[PDB]
Ligand binder design. Structure first.
Ligand code: SF4
Ligand code: SF4
Lengths: 150, 71
């Protein structure tokens, strides 16, 4: 089991760009916290990682699909929970790219939660562009008052 | 990585990596002294008393002769 986990966390960090310093979700990252806990301490891949252009997904979700690991979590969230069906896993192989095939802002509300859904920095809040870090933020378990769902 | 940081053109293998870091030269350094080499080659117990006492015997004779000249 541990060798299988290390194997996979090497593949994920293989074509993944070294964007952790410039990644908005640098501290709060499943990939960083699984590599630093279950993945191997070193990487043997020394070649040309694949890179992906940044899709325009609107004024909410800043997208850096190079970081994205193509786990498909968001393309499932938009199809099922958000129910708008705009995101897609275009292409096959390493060339897999997540996002709308035509430039299409995620017109759906409830589609800003894809950032919390995303286990990787790729999909991040564009309003919270880089303004802070996962460790600076003091958290209060407040409620919301915008809409009456509370 | 670690085979793209320490290149050494060729080398056919992950071993034989350059590995040039600081250390003693081949054959170590010189034998360094650590003991207390305090040389006691000074005037002995005598030769210091006999230099002093020789003076307070000839020099005092000279004080006497100078007192005779002054008188
Ligand atoms: S998601 Fe961002 S912070 Fe996490 S490993 Fe990838 S580049 Fe680094
Ligand atoms: S949730 Fe994030 S990491 Fe997963 S496929 Fe979508 S963009 Fe890629």
């Amino acid at each position: 089991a541990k060798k299988a986990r290390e194997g996979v966390m090497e593949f994920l960090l293989m074509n993944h760009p070294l964007d952790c310093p410039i990644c908005d979700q640098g501290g709060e990252c499943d990939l960083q916290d699984q590599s630093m806990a279950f993945g191997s301490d070193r990487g043997r891949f020394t070649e040309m990682k694949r890179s992906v252009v940044d899709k325009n997904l609107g004024p909410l979700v800043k997208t850096v699909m190079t970081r994205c690991i193509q786990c498909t979590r968001c393309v499932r969230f938009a199809s099922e929970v958000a129910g708008v069906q705009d995101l897609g896993i275009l292409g096959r192989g390493s060339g897999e790219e997540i996002g709308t095939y035509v430039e299409k802002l995620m017109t759906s509300e409830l589609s800003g939660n894809v950032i919390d859904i995303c286990p990787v920095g790729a999909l991040t809040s564009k309003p919270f562009a880089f303004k802070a870090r996962n460790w600076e933020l003091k958290a209060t378990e407040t409620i919301d008052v915008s809409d009456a769902v509370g | 990585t670690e085979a793209m940081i320490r290149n050494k053109p060729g080398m056919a293998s992950v071993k034989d990596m350059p590995l040039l870091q600081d250390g003693p030269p081949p054959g170590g350094f010189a034998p360094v002294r650590y003991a207390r080499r305090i040389s006691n080659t000074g005037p002995s117990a005598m030769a210091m008393f006999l230099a002093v006492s020789g003076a307070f015997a000839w020099g005092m004779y000279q004080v006497g002769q100078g007192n005779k000249i002054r008188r």
